[PDB]
From Swiss-Prot:
Disulfide bonds join C2-C122, C41-C171. GO terms for biological process: vasodilation. Binds 1 heme b (iron(II)-protoporphyrin IX) group per subunit. SUPFAM superfamilies: Lipocalins (SSF50814). GO terms for molecular function: histamine binding; metal ion binding; nitric oxide binding; oxidoreductase activity. Its cofactor is heme b. GO terms for cellular component: extracellular region. This is Nitrophorin-4. It is an enzyme of class 1 (oxidoreductase). The keyword Cell membrane does not apply. Salivary gland (at protein level). Keywords: Disulfide bond, Heme, Iron, Metal-binding, Oxidoreductase, Secreted, Signal, Vasoactive, Vasodilator.
Amino acid sequence: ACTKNAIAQTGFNKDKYFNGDVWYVTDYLDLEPDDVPKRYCAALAAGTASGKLKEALYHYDPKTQDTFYDVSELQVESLGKYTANFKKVDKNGNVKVAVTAGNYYTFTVMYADDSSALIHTCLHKGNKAAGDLYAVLNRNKDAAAGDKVKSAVSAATLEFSKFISTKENNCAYDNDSLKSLLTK
Ligand code: HEM
Ligand SMILES: [N+]
């Protein structure tokens, strides 16, 4: 189950975060593992498309090759805190699994600047158990976590040493698909 009410960044700059560009997950902390794989790849694009707040997601398991994309129109709970009802799509935006009640994630931006971010997410997917997942993001897929985002991890009363890196997985991303999925 999810247990955290994550606090959004004071003074969160939504237009900068939701600028249409890509964010890569560099490190993550799942509070209820044996539930996500140790080795994983994920990225997202976040932007406004025709007036609608959107996120496109990519997941890739580098060992199994399991791959999937999603798109959601985000609803606002408060500044920096969103609810996202997702649809599974192919890379071109064709629907594989339609939006449904009970398929949603929450999304809280705890820290962001132009190059880095710390987010919390709680995924609800049908009758699957939910659990808290924190992710350190960067605009540069290869960037080591810097002092701004590591300090934010500490300020959330988390230990960065517990986060698992994605950097050793040979992750290659289709940035073009993520950007184009924002419109879909
Ligand atoms: C921005 C961060 C992330 C968000 C918003 C997010 C969101 C989601 C969503 C919406 C799904 C369901 C997709 C679908 O069924 O259509 C999903 C599935 C999954 N995610 Fe993430 N995810 C994120 C990062 C990660 C990371 C870093 C991992 C690490 C392993 C991960 C592991 C998984 C796994 C294993 C599933 C499949 C769940 C299942 O059906 O059993 N995710 N995620
Ligand atoms: N997830």
